[model samples]
Target: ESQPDPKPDELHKSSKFTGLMENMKVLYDDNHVSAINVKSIDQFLYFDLIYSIKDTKLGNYDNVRVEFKNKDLADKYKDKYVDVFGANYYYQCYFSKKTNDINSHQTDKRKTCMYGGVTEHNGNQLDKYRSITVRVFEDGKNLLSFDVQTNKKKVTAQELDYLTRHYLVKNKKLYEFNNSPYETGYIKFIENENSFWYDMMPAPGDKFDQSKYLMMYNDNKMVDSKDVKIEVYLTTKKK
Candidate 1:
């Protein structure tokens, strides 16, 4: 008895394999068919296939890799060659001796927050969701409701600078918040209201009390700290 012809249907059983075949067609259209490599991790009995294509437009090469987690499943294509990009290529099989450990990097364990304007980092420090209410005070009354958020980590000076500037522009304040926290005002992350606030009075000769007032042209307007409220939401970061 003789072995039967390779069934294309066998390869199509796995959507992943089909996708790789489709990509090969595209690579051929771009005239970028250089080399192909496939390796199987002995420990998990899975295979990873990688192919590289020259990217003339980007002055570089682009590579694509596809993985299958089942050894028996991957064997279906072993010792077989298929018509990819109008050319025959073998799905050569090889074994690897790598482990399956997942805790590979400590930096990956660090946490970061993604907000509308900025991302806050929490390293070694506790992480949690917080809401902050920014109360703007003008004529001793509440002026605006602004909500903010932060984690239980120390807010760095640089991070604070970015946060302050982002908020100032968003609120349509006349003057831009200059990137400086001199001898007067301080940038603080408020956890209770999930927000950040600039808390300080103006020192003599200072341009303006940014936390207290918005000064543009004839308008020397006070931002009622008591009236502004900020919103904050708690979230988790994935490693």
Candidate 2:
């Protein structure tokens, strides 16, 4: 019996048996694929990259990983910018881990406001959905609205720096995201509202008293979380 001559594309084709053979080849090329010997920036620390397929029929799968670097790098865009379809989703610092065995409760302090953004489809920006205004609170009082434009790009070291500087805008002490007090991660919406205000104390805000105002966005319109709108706001309410 004679086999057909190898075609030009055969160099890239892997048969069923070849596929299994290729996997074993991974072991010999350990350093190339070794998570341990890989550059520290590409290695997972405390967290790891993950892959998923939202719709297998559509071949819409995703590949993502978590890496710790000495400087800010977007893994996807630390050195470059990326375009997304209007319907595809993007997320960062996601903790999918949860204890389903028990109900969890903590003192209501930090608050978040979430507003959904544009979607991506087939590598193209698609029709955006109506905005959602999420106001997180404790017993009807404000903790801090997570409702702002902060997502869209990679989280930077500058943000980590800010996270370490401010006290919890909610409870001044007990809890800390990083280190400092007057800072926070780049949020989705507050990023949109350029100049917003913060009361240094745990008191509600009023416009009359100039003392309680920290950062105020005395701008013309609300800033979109993903936009570079220059809304104005403050970090401490002067009191």
Candidate 3:
């Protein structure tokens, strides 16, 4: 699955987000928050929004903030929220209020936290029987994703599929896709070439799952380095 990104607006702009708010009256949305099923509000649910502004390169201080219907819900579910999610999920944040608020030290800030919620990645395969749909609404626009599974149940078929459709291309050509299917364009680039590992590692703190995952390499051997960067340049193409 793809790593999560910050929601476009802190106001909860996605359909899945608003739907949750509409159904449970628990207003929230964040990829870093705990799952929604583990709620303490009796009938209500909660989640958070994760992101960083102007400090993308700054580490540790960036965080996800939880938003609940009221202080009671926020307090009640705070523990369960932490148990399932980690402290890093949420963060302490502030906005600028002074004339130089943009870079002022006393800017408005809060301790924010987040837990994981429901989300799935999918696509369709002409040979596979499975089908999937992903939807998100932003800035009053609804973004829908349809994923069909390709059934390469056999090893040979899977190999050929990977070779022709995925593995054969170089880093540059692999990223040159006819259609942008991912929320981030970087994903498209990685789909066709495994060689981009030479570029950068996805998450610096995490280890690459050697046997079952891709490993980013700085040279012949898979060594970790922070000299690489992967940029996502997809312009949201609405359907």
Candidate 4:
């Protein structure tokens, strides 16, 4: 008898935040989660739209935001609605407005949106998986990712660079890939030529029980994980 592979867990939320978001209704293409904590402060509610998932995919909208003041919550109990998911679970934020109004409502909730999205990281577009998809393979004890935008190379040196520079550090690298089956791109964090520790300490062969279990963060905020389709080959085509 064989056991089925373990499932990717939902991103964890704090007990306080869990209680806060317990009753929230998030309606963006049915993302499974509502509120993910993004460094709470009295001034504003910071969150990543990429954090929201439905059936293990990212939310449909771009990054969303709503504002509050030190006084507003200071005077009143913080409602999860206002603090995290605001008005219809999103807010029509402003570039300029009366200071009297820190948050505003969009008659059409679907219209609520923001700009300068982090969803695009070179060619590993998070929106493709509807969230961040971390796809890795044993590239000779090396894990290279696929580039979603260009379906040419499974060995994406560019994505490895982008993830390192934009997200974190050097020496350790993960290749970027997109088209094993052409759905989306894959990303990972590696320690060296034969060591990947996206969620574990660096080890040889990089044999992970479940690559989906790896926690590849977006800004160290949204704890994102999804069902990554990993296709293993007997011989790595690293040429």
lDDT of 4: 0.25
| Per-residue accuracy of model 1 over 1-239 as CA lDDT, tens digit each | 12232232221111122112232222113232222222211222234332222333643333322223344423543333311111112232122222336521111111111111111122313446444454443323445546555442333222223333346334523122232211122233333334334322233332332212211101111122223333211111111
Misplaced by over 4 Å in model 1 are 1-128, 157-161, 176-239
**Residue 215 of candidate 2: its Cα lDDT?**
14
Assess each prediction's global lDDT (C-alpha) against the native: 0.27, 0.23, 0.25, 0.25
What does candidate 2's lDDT look like per residue over 92-208, in tens digits? Answer: 222223223443211122111111111111232224422323343332355543322233232221221122212223333311222222211122223422333222222222112
Model 3 Cα displacement at 79 (Å)?
2.1
Show model 2 residue runs off by greater than 4 Å: 1-134, 140-146, 151-239
lDDT tens per residue, model 3, 26-132:
11111122222232322112223222222233333433333333455345434342222221222132223222534322223433333221121122112433222
- Pick the winner on TM-score between candidates 1 and 4: 1
- List TM-score per model, in order: 0.24, 0.18, 0.20, 0.21
**How many steric clashes between backbone atoms does each model show?**
33, 68, 25, 11
Q: Write the per-residue lDDT of candidate 4 for residues 35-65, one digit (tens) a residue.
A: 3233222222333222221222434443333
Find the 10 residues in a row with the least total lDDT in model 3. Answer: 215-224
Better of 1 and 3 by lDDT: 1
- After superposition, which runs of candidate 3 have C-alpha atoms over 4 Å from their true positions? 1-64, 81-132, 135-145, 148-239
Candidate that would win on lDDT = 1
Q: Report the Cα lDDT for residue 154, model 4.
A: 25
